[PDB]
Symmetry: D2
Subunit: 115 residues, 4 copies
């Protein structure tokens, strides 16, 4: 029920091998590690979680943009891109978090569907 997709606006390509860390806000207001992974050759990251495990909560999807651009030997502006949202509070939904990256800019959108 959670997928992350990342595209590269400089290369005109998927953003491959982008590290993504997902956190969930705990009872004590700390960010607890929830899941992580890397984008594939398609720019997509599938299989982060399950419908059982992806309960209601406030989630943070941290897209490691600096590490991405540095691995390409480019000096970027941002440390990361974060997307923070409440999920599943009206029951289970499916979420795609998409991001488009440039060295000094990024854009994100969500696609939320009810299965």
């Amino acid at each position: 029920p959670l997928m992350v997709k990342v595209l590269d606006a400089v290369r005109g390509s998927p953003a491959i091998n982008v590290a993504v860390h997902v956190f969930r806000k705990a009872a004590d207001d700390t960010w607890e590690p929830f899941a992580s992974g890397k984008t594939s050759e398609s720019g997509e990251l599938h299989g982060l979680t399950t419908e059982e495990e992806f309960v209601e909560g406030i989630y943070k999807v941290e897209i490691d943009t600096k590490s991405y651009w540095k691995a390409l030997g480019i000096s970027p502006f941002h440390e990361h891109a974060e997307v923070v949202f409440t999920a599943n509070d009206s029951g289970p939904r499916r979420y795609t978090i998409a991001a488009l990256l440039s060295p000094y800019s990024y854009s994100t959108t969500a696609v939320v569907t009810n299965p």
Copy 2:
């Protein structure tokens, strides 16, 4: 070798039933109709053309954003969104033209791959 995808930044959903017209610049410098279609329930428009027909040229992908937003009963700013590019000039490529829509803004990117 050509796919168009449109998302709605207000609804957090695919932009369904968006009309898309593709033109190709003719020898006389006019825009010749090349292909057209509508986005599906996924926001994607597949099958516009073929690798035989999608020759080198300058192409214009016109995304009928005003018609989209008016069909939803919203008064938008832009008449359409255009994406104009040279295609296949180093041999055949596959192109995805993606757009993200709001009433007063849009963003587009291209993903170009070599099959």
Copy 3:
């Protein structure tokens, strides 16, 4: 009543010395030249028109993104960027057309105020 602003998402800067041409749609559906200029050091292009000249109608703002990128040694995807909209006197009176450029992407918004 019309200002155009262009930014560069690769360098994190204004997009300076970018050619911008504005057209008005004529009765016969052709695009008539209306105003033009080059963005300044701030990425802004002021003084394109006046209230008296800027009547309701459909306008196209064409931004010469291809020349911009090539002058920076980058091959870009687009031939140019276009922003086509209707000026409406029932809405606010000043229009800012902003664009954010990358080699394979562009984003634009309208900021329309009184």
Copy 4:
């Protein structure tokens, strides 16, 4: 040396009276409050800091997008928008952090000039 500008892609306007909080990363990796304010009628927030105070380091700009949308009667997706970056004295000296808001999307760029 730091200005934050927020625009609304739904209304085609500045995003007015939006709360913005700036933090600096401390030695212990916590976020220390640094500056805050609300955007003006132009969507801009000026005067957050001074050159003397704005030393190299990692900063976070948090924009209270959720309150903004709810005050307009819209349920938005995000809890807030964050922009996290490093200030580097080897680059240009003035930073503008711009954000463009929609209910389910945001876009941001940095304009860094001398």
